[PDB]
């Protein structure tokens, strides 16, 4: 109901801001009498330096941390400074039969995409009969993942397919 102050403060468009001070500060300083209402001292040069200048996209680092001791990823001759940021060599060292490591070059780690690279498909999979069956079912299974994720999801799918087509 007492919209008078509201409409006046809204009408007060001009740039000069000293009327509110001279109009209110006397009354408040008379009633409230703090010589230092905020006696804490504040003199701050906030930012000195904040950069490691050696970090790859941190989101990928989280996944490489969450990886199981069975998996292990690395880096090849890397076109992966900051944008691609990955084309790894993940050897699925586990209890069952081993295989050939894929590249899995992923996009920016924000991940509005997935990894799959499929580089060494040409000679590695056609050469062996078992490796040929490994690729077969694994492609069909990867054509099912809705928006797969780079390290954990794709690596686990690869291991599961490798140890499932093994039969």
């Amino acid at each position: 109901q007492p919209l008078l102050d509201a409409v006046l403060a809204n009408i007060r468009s001009p740039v000069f801001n000293h009327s509110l001070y001279r109009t209110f500060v006397p009354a408040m300083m008379a009633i409230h009498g703090p010589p230092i209402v905020s006696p804490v001292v504040c003199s701050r040069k906030r930012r000195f330096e904040e950069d490691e200048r050696q970090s790859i996209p941190n989101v990928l680092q989280g996944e490489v941390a969450r990886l199981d001791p069975k998996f292990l990823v690395n880096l090849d001759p890397s076109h992966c400074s900051n944008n691609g940021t990955v084309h790894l060599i993940c050897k699925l060292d586990d209890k069952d039969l081993p295989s050939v490591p894929p590249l899995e070059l992923s996009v920016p780690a924000d991940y509005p995409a997935q990894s799959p690279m499929w580089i060494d498909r040409q000679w590695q999979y056609d050469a062996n009969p078992f490796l040929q069956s490994v690729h077969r079912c694994m492609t069909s299974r990867l054509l099912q993942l809705p928006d797969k994720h780079s390290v954990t999801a794709l690596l686990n799918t690869w291991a599961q397919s490798i140890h499932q087509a093994c039969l």
């Binding site: 801001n17 008379a30 040069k45």
Partner: protein
């Protein structure tokens, strides 16, 4: 020199200085004694009376209050000003501002209200302090008791523009290109900075446009060199 006055015998602006030989109390008598006609230069007196003339209106009070507190842990406290000439100029400013407030209702505030004529009492105190300051005499009695009485009007917390120093005493200093190393009233200071805020070399920190109409005399006086602070400086918000 702001006076766009009428004809006069000789330099009507000098009468405000010749008014020294006048009565102590009741400036209303002193003004009729000296002159009352040729002291109106512009009907738009609403240019410096409310914004600029509040400075002297508060400084007179802060000087009067600082008198009975000589026991403070400081030689003058904040300021002493026991020379007399400055006090005489202050009294002349009080006379001309009384004339202004008589011409137009935008005078210096009572600083709250309820002075039954706050200007009259302030002028009486100024003159009582000024009489025994004029020409080689002792200084203050009843004045010390009168200044002790505070009306329901007196504010405090005046700007008092000061300048930080550079105390690199005798050994060494180690600064940086940035990241400063810790060791004016014409508006010019809202609660939070929201204008140009063209600082100066020592204390000024005055806005650039000032958002005014006819007080550009001060602006032209300050755009150029200043009180050893002509190096005006721009500082962001």
């Amino acid at each position: 020199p702001h006076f766009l006055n009428t004809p006069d015998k000789s330099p009507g602006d000098r009468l405000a200085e010749i008014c020294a030989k006048i009565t102590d109390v009741d400036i209303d008598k002193v003004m009729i004694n000296l002159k009352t006609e040729e002291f109106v230069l512009d009907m738009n007196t609403l240019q410096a009376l409310q914004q600029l003339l509040q400075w002297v209106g508060d400084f007179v009070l802060y000087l009067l209050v600082s008198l009975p507190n000589q026991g403070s842990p400081l030689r003058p406290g904040h300021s002493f000003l026991r020379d007399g000439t400055s006090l005489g100029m202050l009294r002349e400013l009080m006379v001309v501002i009384r004339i202004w407030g008589l011409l137009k209702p935008s005078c210096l505030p009572v600083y709250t209200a309820t002075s039954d004529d706050s200007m009259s009492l302030l002028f009486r105190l100024l003159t009582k302090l000024w009489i025994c300051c004029r020409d080689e005499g002792a200084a203050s009695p009843a004045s010390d008791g009168l200044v002790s009485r505070l009306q329901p009007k007196q504010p405090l917390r005046l700007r008092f523009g000061r300048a930080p120093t550079l105390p690199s005493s005798t050994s060494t200093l180690q600064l940086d290109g940035l990241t400063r190393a810790p060791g004016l009233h014409l508006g010019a200071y809202p609660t939070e900075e929201c204008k140009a805020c063209t600082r100066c070399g020592c204390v000024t920190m005055l806005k650039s446009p000032n958002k005014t109409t006819a007080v550009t005399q001060w602006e032209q006086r300050w755009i150029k060199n200043c009180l050893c602070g002509g190096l005006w400086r721009r500082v962001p918000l």
